[PDB]
Write a protein that binds this ligand. Structure first.
Ligand SMILES: Cc1cc2nc3c(=O)[nH]c(=O)nc-3n(C[C@H](O)[C@H](O)[C@H](O)COP(=O)(O)O)c2cc1C
Ligand SMILES: Cc1cc2nc3c(=O)[nH]c(=O)nc-3n(C[C@H](O)[C@H](O)[C@H](O)COP(=O)(O)O)c2cc1C
Ligand SMILES: N[C@@H](Cc1ccc(O)c(I)c1)C(=O)O
Ligand SMILES: N[C@@H](Cc1ccc(O)c(I)c1)C(=O)O
Lengths: 215, 215
């Protein structure tokens, strides 16, 4: 069965102004690594997560699981395991030169200070109630896109985030007790920014370095 | 060097209402496969693309190239190559059962009818002017997220899109003449929806199937 499309449509002038304003708005977004521990209603995070879940996906499999962690003990254990992996990584060269402008150590207090950690898992396949497996398609792409929606929703809500690698992969899977068809994809602490929060003075690429037009 | 974070912040009640409204808004987004060929100013697409490019990325490499195609001859050649690949795929089983509710053939008139095709490329590495290579990190994740921003921006602008696999991979790379460090990631036709546009009557997963909360 099919149904008519019910999306809002605008005339060219509204479209120009809307697209210009959204660009300016999203250009203000920056990765923030120093959080306030100020509380946020679960309902806001739920809205944000289900917004991420409206993303398109290969064959409409929605091959993702969002684990929302506010439990300070689990956050503590996650931070501990994460800080341990990085300690080994930060001493054992191309990489280290690329990382210089961000001023990051193996320290990760944001993993406990942020009121919520959103841990994104990808699903390689679904397990029917039969025990049988049914594979999903273009999972990497689908979950990446959903993560894009997640971050867009976080910004829309006036919050900040830090997109973080899912290390330690094994530990995240264990402590959050996710099944075999799932693997950690991203780790995203969410919260208000610290009052005096600073970010690296970075510049994004210009149109010419990012965009190629075939008229 | 560092600079203060300059993002908009709201009080809990605005945050709740903003997050609820954005969820409803994004829930109206649907993949559309029947387009209007109504023209759109390049400036809107530029705004949309540079909005995608504000996404976070591993080590701030922004490992992506956005190829915007409006040239009807290139679109014609792309559609031809794409339709040929799919013809072979649609006859040569798990997949075909999963694809039934979308009612798609190997036909792809949208690849010419859509006023713009946005072809997203990922960059495995950068090539310095020395000829030397400098690898990028978590490219799949970064470009996926940027694609999420792209689609969020398209919806914000009142347009629709079809997230499409980058097939034929080799052909897209050839006709768009992209260098060796680049590979096709996604194909995204963009435009107004056809007046009587229909979409599959799908239902997205509920909170419980998508979300796990550790209180
Ligand atoms: C896939 C991915 C992984 C990332 N991993 C880390 C990380 O492990 N540690 C960190 O401090 N930042 C991480 N980041 C944040 C980037 O460093 C940041 O997005 C980049 O420096 C650009 O800053 P901006 O997002 O404010 O534009 C990651 C970003 C992405 C997209
Ligand atoms: C990575 C990816 C690849 C996709 N490839 C195709 C495709 O090749 N053909 C197609 O008709 N739709 C494709 N889609 C669209 C999905 O089928 C669509 O998002 C899904 O059916 C859910 O519909 P919705 O986006 O309206 O919620 C793709 C989506 C994603 C995320
Ligand atoms: N690319 C093919 C088949 C297809 C269709 C839908 C979809 O979500 C996925 I992943 C693949 C096509 O366009 O028909
Ligand atoms: N995960 C490490 C190192 C790091 C840092 C930034 C970055 O963009 C990437 I990819 C990796 C850390 O958190 O320090």
């Amino acid at each position: 069965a099919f149904i008519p499309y019910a999306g809002a449509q605008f005339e060219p002038e509204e479209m120009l102004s809307k697209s210009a304003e959204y660009y300016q708005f999203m250009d203000h977004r920056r990765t923030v690594r120093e959080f306030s521990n100020r509380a946020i209603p679960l309902e806001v995070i739920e809205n944000i997560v289900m917004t991420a879940s409206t993303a398109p996906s290969g064959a409409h499999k929605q091959p993702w699981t969002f684990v929302v962690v506010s439990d300070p003990q689990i956050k503590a254990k996650i931070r501990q395991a994460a800080e341990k992996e990085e300690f080994e990584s930060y001493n054992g060269n191309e990489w280290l030169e690329d990382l210089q402008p961000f001023g990051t150590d193996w320290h990760k207090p944001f993993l406990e200070i942020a009121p919520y950690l959103i841990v994104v898992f990808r699903k390689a396949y679904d397990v029917l109630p039969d025990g049988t497996q049914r594979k999903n398609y273009y999972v990497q792409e689908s979950v990446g896109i959903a993560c894009g929606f997640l971050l867009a929703a976080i910004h829309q809500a006036g919050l900040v985030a830090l997109t973080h690698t899912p290390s330690p992969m094994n530990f995240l899977q264990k402590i959050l007790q996710r099944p075999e068809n799932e693997r950690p994809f991203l780790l995203v602490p969410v919260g208000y920014p610290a009052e005096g929060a600073m970010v690296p003075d970075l510049q994004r690429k210009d149109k010419a370095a990012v965009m190629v037009v075939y008229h």
